[PDB]
């Protein structure tokens, strides 16, 4: 099953059904997702008048690395600096969304003294034992009442977290320290809304697991539906991400009107591509110039390469195999042609085509798909056709989806933000390393053209709940974003106590930036640290007491 995101106008449901597209979900007034067989002819979508835009759903991967280092780890209390509060603010009345690998809801650290679950709602997109949530076409929805019975019966079968990152995230936000009190999370009275996303294996490299944009967008619809029903503020914590990009405009998440409402806040990790060499930056100085971009491939099965030209610049492209066989030398043409072929010695096939993603507003990007790729040096030969600045960017998939040795020969760590964290409509969090008193080497960096991340937070070897009633440690920007999510829940309750219609992302981001710690002699803001390090105590003092970072 592949899937597509669709921007529609009119009666899209009738139109899809008339075209034999029977598996779909309408997610908001503009956005639908469809699920179709592998043999599906995507050109169909151009001849459905109710379709305005369409894009194949791309892989997403975790922003957390599990590091098995509890003995030298840092507690959540230390990372979030929450002794200043707890040593009447608990996160009461705030909903927190975890969209990830699920949750081990039988972990004692998610069970209250009276035996009830800290999870309010759980949608397991893979399960088939309860009906899906209303308006969705797969998985099983569970409520706290059901989880409470499951806890009483020690029934862990409703939904399992087989990876552990969702459990790690949930513990940062809300673990109660039942097994080890030192390891408790940030909030005590916030409710969790958990979605376990459908998973896929071996997309590029054997043994690696990814998620898919379409399923993620459906999860966004579900958790915001719940927030609307419960009429409570909601923080959505993005601990997974698509591939990195240099674009800084809004994403397809901007189709959700609810994400522009008061009391609905999106926090994302910045990305974990700061040192993974999955980004190439280049610049043409003239038209007709040829530049060769060197890619080393490890033992990948497949690879997707995205080229973006950041402006009106037009660039042609050709793929060259380690043995010297070449692909079509493609140029801009006003058609949807997919150029295909085979590198005979390598037995590798390619598909190259221009893509029109929603985020670039009609500007084409170049997509190159290599299948059955073999190890060695691959060359992307680029020819400029029209330039103003001449600048361009190329991205490989996130490193945790591809072979360890797959990389650009000449990488650029700048402009490695994961794409959904690029927009100013999200609070974007990078990872500080308290052990080295510096940024984590893996933390993605903002672009120079255009500031991300907004702030950073401790996120190296953080101890949290893990599967099967254990503790483990995690590192990365999904850890840091979880720290900020939990602290923001405390800040939102503090603001409400001493109007909720004013708790917009922009307001909360301003307070986080005003309270952030700036280390001596560095220049701020910068594309590594943003405006500085999260500081709960100083942010409260700012809330209590021209000061805007753009004024």
Residue numbers in the entry: 2 to 88, 93 to 455, 458 to 505, 509 to 555, 560 to 565
Pull text from the paper.
The major nosocomial pathogen Clostridioides difficile depends on spore germination to initiate infection. Interestingly, C. difficile’s germinant sensing mechanism differs markedly from other spore-forming bacteria, since it uses bile acids to induce germination and lacks the transmembrane germinant receptors conserved in almost all spore-forming organisms. Instead, C. difficile is thought to use CspC, a soluble pseudoprotease, to sense these unique bile acid germinants. While C. difficile strains encode homologs of all three Csp proteins, only CspB has an intact Asp, His, and Ser catalytic triad, since CspA and CspC carry mutations in two of the catalytic residues that render them pseudoproteases.
To gain insight into the molecular mechanisms by which C. difficile spores sense germinant, we solved the crystal structure of C. difficile CspC to 1.55 Å resolution. Furthermore, diffraction quality crystals were only obtained with wild-type CspC in the absence of bile acids. Determination of the crystal structure of the C. difficile CspC pseudoprotease revealed that it shares a conserved three domain architecture with the C. perfringens CspB protease, consisting of an N-terminal prodomain, subtilase domain, and jelly roll domain. Despite this shared secondary structure, C. difficile CspC does not autoprocess its prodomain due to substitutions in its catalytic triad. In addition, CspC’s prodomain is more closely associated with the subtilase and jelly roll domains due to a clamping loop shown in the surface representation. This loop resides between beta strand 4 and helix 4 within the subtilase domain (residues 203–216) and interacts with the jelly roll domain via packing of tyrosine 209 and tyrosine 210 as well as hydrogen bonds from arginine 213 to backbone carbonyls in the 402–407 residue loop of the jelly roll domain. Interestingly, the degenerate site residues of CspC’s pseudotriad share the same orientation as the catalytic triad of CspB and other subtilisin-like serine proteases. When the interfaces between each of the three subdomains were evaluated by buried surface area analysis, a larger contact area is observed between each of the domains in CspC as compared to CspB (3200 Å2 for CspC vs. 2270 Å2 for CspB, calculated with PDBe PISA). Surprisingly, even with the extensive interactions between the different sub-domains of CspC, residues in both the jelly roll domain and prodomain have higher B-factors than nearby residues in the subtilase domain. Two additional residues exhibited considerable conformational flexibility in the CspC structure: arginine 456 and glycine 457, which lacked sufficient electron density to be included in our model for CspC.
